[PDB]
Amino acid sequence: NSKIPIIFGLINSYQIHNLLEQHNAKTKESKAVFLIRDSSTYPGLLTISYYCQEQDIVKHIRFGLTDKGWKTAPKPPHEPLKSDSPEIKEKYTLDKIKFERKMKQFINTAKKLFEQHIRAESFKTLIMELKIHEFNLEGLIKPTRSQASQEKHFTDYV
Ligand SMILES: [Cl-]
């Protein structure tokens, strides 16, 4: 009963950076070190945060509960930039429409599953989706008790 979930609660971008640095993420391969948190943008999803060697930036990938367990969420379009050409802006408009449609359905489904205590295993499906995205599970950063998610769904994600 005293075990701490492996899922972070709400954590800010500054602490995400500093936790990745504490575990030497910037001198390891991308995804060799990562953490799993309650998403601050979409409640009921999870966000996997890691360091991207190729672009020297922290990157995030969202998962959500689906009928078969945790799966990768719809991919958001590339965030706009001051340098964006008309061609990039036009693709953004299309990708964003498609993303918002797909994400709305995905979130609505995830929320309904997240609200129920289902007597079927789901933690293993999170582990499996992490493997599908090639996350070094030995490199999982574990929260302290005060850092960990308070969500009832994650009590046994230990
Ligand atoms: Cl997020």
Distance (angstroms) between ligand 1 centre and the Cα of 48 equals 8
CA distances from 77 to 21, 50, 90 (A): 27, 19, 11
Ligand 1 ion local residues (Cβ < 5 A): 39, 41, 47
| Domain span at 73 | 1-158
Q: Any idea how long the chain is?
A: 158
Q: Positive or negative CA dihedral for 53, 55, 57, 62? A: negative
Chain position carrying tokens 């998403």:
39
- Residue 24 CA, ligand 1 centroid: distance in Å: 22
Q: Which amino acid is at 117?
A: H
Is 41 flagged in the annotation as binding? yes
Helix (H/G/I), strand (E/B), else coil: 26: helix
Residue 37 known to bind ligand: yes
Domains held by the chain: number: 1
SS (H, E, C) 85-131: CHHHHHHHHHHHHHHHHHHHHHHHHHHHHHHCCCCCCCHHHHHHHHH
For the chain, how many helices (H) and strands (E)? 3, 4
Distance in angstroms between the alpha carbons of the first and the last residue of the chain: 11
Question: For residue 47, how far is its CA from the centre of ligand 1 (angstroms)?
Answer: 5
Asked whether residue 119 is marked as a ligand-binding residue, the answer is no
Residue 64 forms beta bridges with which residues? 45, 71
Rounded to the nearest 10°, the torsion over CA 129, 137, 48, 106 is 10
- State the Cα–Cα distance between residues 116 and 44, nearest whole angstrom: 11
Residue 78 Cα to ligand 1 midpoint, Å, equals: 15
Dist. CA 35 → ligand 1 center (Å): 12
Say how many Å lie between the CA of residue 137 and the centre of ligand 1: 20
Ligand 1 geometric centre to CA of 99 (Å): 14
Positive or negative, the CA dihedral 13, 15, 18, 19 is negative
In eight-state DSSP terms, residue 35 is E
- The verdict on whether residue 155 carries a ligand-binding annotation is no
Q: How far apart are CA 103 and CA 98, in angstroms?
A: 8
Cα separation, 88 vs 123, whole angstroms: 38
Map tokens 């993303």 to a residue: 99
75 belongs to an annotated ligand binding site = yes
Kindly report the number of other CB atoms within 10 A of residue 131's CB atom. 11
**% helix / strand / coil in the chain, to the nearest 5?**
35, 20, 45
